[PDB]
Design a binder for these strands. Sequence first.
RNA 1: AUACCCUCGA
Lengths: 1338, 302, 97
Amino acid sequence: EFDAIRIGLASPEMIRSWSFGEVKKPETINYRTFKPERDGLFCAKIFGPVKDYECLCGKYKRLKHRGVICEKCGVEVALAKVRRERMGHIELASPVAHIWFLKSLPSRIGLLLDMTLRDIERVLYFESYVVIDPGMTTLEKGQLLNDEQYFEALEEFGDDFDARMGAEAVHELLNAIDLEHEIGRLREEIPQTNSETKIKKLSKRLKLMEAFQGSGNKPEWMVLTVLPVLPPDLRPLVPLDGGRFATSDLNDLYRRVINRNNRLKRLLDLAAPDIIVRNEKRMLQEAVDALLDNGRRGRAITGSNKRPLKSLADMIKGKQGRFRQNLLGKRVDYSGRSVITVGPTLRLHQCGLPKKMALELFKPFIFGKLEGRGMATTIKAAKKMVERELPEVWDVLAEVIREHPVLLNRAPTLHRLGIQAFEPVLIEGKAIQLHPLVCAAYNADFDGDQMAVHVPLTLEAQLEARALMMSTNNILSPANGEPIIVPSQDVVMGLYYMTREAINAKGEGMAFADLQEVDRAYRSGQASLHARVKVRINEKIKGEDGQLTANTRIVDTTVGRALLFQVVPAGLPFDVVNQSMKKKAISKLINHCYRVVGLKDTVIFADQLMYTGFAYSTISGVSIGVNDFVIPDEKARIINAATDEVKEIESQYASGLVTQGEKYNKVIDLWSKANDEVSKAMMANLSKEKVVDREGKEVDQESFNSMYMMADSGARGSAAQIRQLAGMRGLMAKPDGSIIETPITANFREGLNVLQYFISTHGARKGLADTALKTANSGYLTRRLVDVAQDLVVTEIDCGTEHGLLMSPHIEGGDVVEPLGERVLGRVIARDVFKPGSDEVIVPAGTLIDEKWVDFLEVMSVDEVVVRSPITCETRHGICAMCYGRDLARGHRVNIGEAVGVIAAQSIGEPGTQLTADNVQVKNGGTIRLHNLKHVVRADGALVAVSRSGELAVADDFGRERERYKLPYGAVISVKEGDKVDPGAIVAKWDPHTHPIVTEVDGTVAFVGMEEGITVKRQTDELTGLTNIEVMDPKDRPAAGKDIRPAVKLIDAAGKDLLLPGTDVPAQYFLPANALVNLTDGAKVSIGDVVARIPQTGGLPRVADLFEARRPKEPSILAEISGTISFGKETKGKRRLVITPNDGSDPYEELIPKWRHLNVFEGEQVNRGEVISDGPSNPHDILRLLGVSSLAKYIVNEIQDVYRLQGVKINDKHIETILRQMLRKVEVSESGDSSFIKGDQVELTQVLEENEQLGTEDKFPAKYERVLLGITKASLSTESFISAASFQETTRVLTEAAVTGKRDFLRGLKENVVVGRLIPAGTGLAYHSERKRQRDLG
Amino acid sequence: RTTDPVRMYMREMGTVELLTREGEIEIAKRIEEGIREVMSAIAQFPGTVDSILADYNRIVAEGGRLSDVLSGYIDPEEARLRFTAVSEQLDKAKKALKQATAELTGLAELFMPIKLVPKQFDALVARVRSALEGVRAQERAIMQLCVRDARMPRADFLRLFPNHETDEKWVDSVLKSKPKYAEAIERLRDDILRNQQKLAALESEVELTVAEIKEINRAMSIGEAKARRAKKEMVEANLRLVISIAKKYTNRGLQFLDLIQEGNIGLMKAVDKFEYRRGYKFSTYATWWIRQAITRSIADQA
Amino acid sequence: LYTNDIDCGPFISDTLKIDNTSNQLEALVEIYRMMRPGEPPTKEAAETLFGNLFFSAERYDLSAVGRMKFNRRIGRTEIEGPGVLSKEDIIDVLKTL
RNA sequence: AUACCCUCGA
Ligand SMILES: [Mg+2]
């Protein structure tokens, strides 16, 4: 065994140790005799023998001496496999710099010499000298000299100045670094300079120097004086048929390097002139650079082809970018594929398998069984029987297939559900038969899809297939507890048609003694499928745990509902099946049955539902005909009216009265209203388009029109599509996004004109083009999500912490978006839950909330609860099994070893393909309550609230808040806390239209410095619209009026100076430009009076932005520290708003440029959490100021809005898991034990602080600040280098690991995947634990 | 910050300019002057002259060919007369080994116009540099011995010892200087003296002293440096020709720089085998060698 | 300097206030430095390179469609024109821009 | 039995 794969620089001595010879000849194989030549790229002396256990001459052919090397044949006789491990070396006449440590964005060789990459490139390209060992001379070691400059320096000095050129000079510089002295000097000079940029550069210098010192790495090794050569089979020449040979790019590059090296030696040995020698050295540097990588500087090309050569960097990068196609993809055996086909006679656990595919896949199993039964003696006979397809081979094939599950997956597997185990059944054909109910999970229709089939071999593999990924096990979606193996289109249609009702039908009225009599009457044809009848039933209810009570009851229902209830298992009431059985109702029924009865009865119920749905959709000859699309009669009248209106509006525009810009909006609004009215009329006609006779007088009933059934049942189609099918198509958008001024009046039944078809083509082309980019972005996003959240696996059971996130129902707006029940279902409680009256414990502790608990919480008036979240659970290297709540694919709590991180990433990324103001008006009646409001009462009781943080809530009678609204600054509210307000009332009468400035104090104000023409302007509007004064702009004012700002000095009614609480200075708010101060100076202004009034995306890109924690073009400016805010000096061009908190004055405040509008009013509480200027928030400021839980709530809500817009439901556990993975790193402020500023894992800092507490001193513990990293940045910054190297930027991370000397302990999922070990999660957890037991404990 | 290597090759080479054919004649005259100087230096080494007499004896005994020994002057019968004269000069110089110095100067004058095949040139160079290597090795041996054992100071080392290396005068003088280091030297008298006996044997083989051999080898080195400088000037002149001719074979399955470097090697070979008395332009002869080099390079890569 | 503020801005005049290029040789050598960086430029070499890139029947050509469309877009009655860019063609494109 | 290019399906 082994562990902890290391990475470091290759020493010339260790490079020699690796090699088995010195490659010296460029050519590979002689054209006359086809054996590799001496000292060539395939020489037998170096790389090994061509034929296993053979030599060059054949002197020794026996298989006995496997290590002896013959006398005439120096090529040691050994196995042919050895050509894969044996490498050689090339001795270069001069050293050449390594391309990776040169051209990486932070140049390691440049950083180690404190000289810019440009200067090093000048030296390497033989353009300028560099100075080595300055000695006692004016020249410095870092000084570069030109030809004339160097000649002058040599003439002036003569000696004591070693100046060189090329990579030889760089090598001479590197080995004279004296890393100890440089580290000491740079550490001494690190705190001397207070510049942030310089301190950052010297900190990076320190990091590199300490990495080199600790890692046992030598700086001179960066410039390789000797380079290896790949073993011949890893750079093979695959002979083309016809005697041609196909040479790999590696062979071409190696040949080029060898040729240039041989040229170098034989031109230095004859003392060629300096210019040509330096040109040859440059060529050798370029050739080695092209061998190592390409396109960085030179972009070398091949012969007679514009395609660049493939270097080793591109080889290790793999295909598909950096996603290793050989170490992660790894085409497998015992596999096949074919087109899929629906099999309606299949049970949920089994799938059809063609005879030939099954016979080919299970061939070794068939051979084994044939030999065991003795029917075949030699394997040749077994092959003859299996190829003859003798009748007895089908019996043994059936025996090997009986209990051997197989794996089926679609091409894009967006989640674990995309590959499930099926117990194959032999079928006659070439297509793979699929169960209809698993198509939804696979997202696989039968329009040409193909599926790959894989045969697990080991008993471990078969048991994992049967116990974890058998199709019956995964009924519920891992993304949300809602079922995924649910009736789809056709079976939903059948079940819906069965459970309908007709006003008058054959067989209506009589009573049936049992469901059996109902079936007997229906099959005999004496009763309609949907006829209102009476039937008594024997339902067994599971109301009490462990006690199944059966009761007999007579229910008024239909024949179809009674028939379908005969399928329902024995734990559910009949009332669950007495409705119309729409798709959502059926899905909820399956979900309820799973959580009540079990799993086996649930799969039986699902199979029975599918069978009956198919049977009764076949019995009902439902069909689509031209008469089914019922065009409403009023559509013609509505269209004519709208055409008359648009003609009138066009005439008005021609008159010039109406502007084109307003006419566009008017006509689009008119046409949208007409389209909505037409659609409403069509739906109202279609839905009730049934007139029936009930023993005389005619009556109406729900329609039996086929298209209406297909919509209402939810089987297939939507109202938006019937809007096109039977109503006007409505407005359509031009490619620029502007809605075309004329709509499509015709529907698909009437047929569109040519122009309308062309517009619909605009729309359809836009959508179809968007689809492919949506798929690509979703794939990239889910790949990044998986690679950032893979190491997270449940390890502990209960971490022990009591921190979590306060979860409350999402009530953004007037309606409840998500009830509290759905948010905390399957979660775990973090603290006590209390009644409306305290001291009464409802939910004690971390009890996993289930259906019973959510019903209990709904019965009580619990509104806000705190639950344990993965962002909590401070356990190290994993997550506790509580803080990650109930598993979603299973009904119970998660089990140790569940890779919830990968499940989270798959859950978030799977539905990506589905992606792309004055006053408050209370909705319903409820007791109004205030939250986070800080305002004093007005003179008359207006209660104007100037605080920016504040909201208005209308709590229900029970106590839960039914609706909440954001109350803005300066809002007058008729405070009636505890007094119920009727629905539609306007309790708060805010009307900002401006930035009002409240006046918390009263008295006769003293507007000091109000200059009419310099600071203010008594400009009155027309018709005496305002008796006020307009403040003069700072630049529009005079030279002296530019610096003068109006100030309303705080005085009382008699002239007494007043000041705001907390600060001695008065609340004399300045009046800036564009102000509205109506109150006369010296007039008593009431408390809260308005003094100064100043007038003021979505889809996959948005969720990607949130998961990368990006900064938009204009981020929202937020307050830094809570306290007394000030005014920003606009003269300097950037507003500086100093903050003076009452608890402690901190004068530090940044300057915000006035390029973006700032809506901040001075003289109020800063409220660090609050916002200073509008705009989309920058995830960071929220994290570093509001906290972690606040950032968690904001990010979760932001992602969930995007997902809920398309109606896809995803549990928040997954988003919180990804958030935990991103917040995994923290930066340190005052270390005492580490570097000043460093990005270290929070686990590392926590461990260091815990050890320091019980250690040398007590102050050794470090203080740190949490930092947020994007997924593409958090994934590349992992401690393991193998995980990052196979994600992205392989070169950068590999060079960083090389210089840093990183070690990778294979303790993640991808590490064990690439190295071929058992996964540290799932069933490999036991193996990993035993390995840890045997390793750590001796 | 151009990254194109061809571009910087053009920049660095573009400083030098061409020259008319009289300039080529002058450069070839410089080459001839250097080789004449080094050959005249070789004349002051009796072993080399005896070796050229032996090669002539092989010529007469048909052990060597006319084209494998001589390369003209500034038919074998003129060679007969010239080597008879040089042998008579050698014998008259050896007879009176004062006036012997004048006799060797006349010997160098007579052997000065002669020109020989490069193989014999490298043989003569190998002999003289081997004598130099022996002297230098004795220097290093004595130096490491005394410095690392007796701690005898480097100042008196580089003051009194040099240029004799053969007589007991320096050992005795250091012994009479009476430091403790001279007392420690007495343990190392035997090895140093027997190595100096070998040096004296080498000198008696060559009949010359250390200072004389140093003078001749220094003059030969100066002549070689002059010839090397002339060749450098000439090849830097013809770099333009080599790039111009290298244009023909770009897409021949080989890089441009490899082609021009092989053509450069060919043109240095051409310079090594170019004479001005042919009365021809250089380009005519350089084209053949450059074509040979480039074509062979491309043929090797098939 | 006949100009205005709201319309007719100094877009060219402001551009001409830079690059410190007075002689046509200075402009030619600057263009040679830009297009062929590194190699030291000579008068003849830079002039030849600029001429070849600008108005040579080889290494540059507008087809009949190209000339017709350029004339139509910049504004010209003649449909047919020279195959190479005219001296005043660049001035016309600058004016249109 | 290696790399590009083209076309096609989900
Ligand atoms: Mg499909």
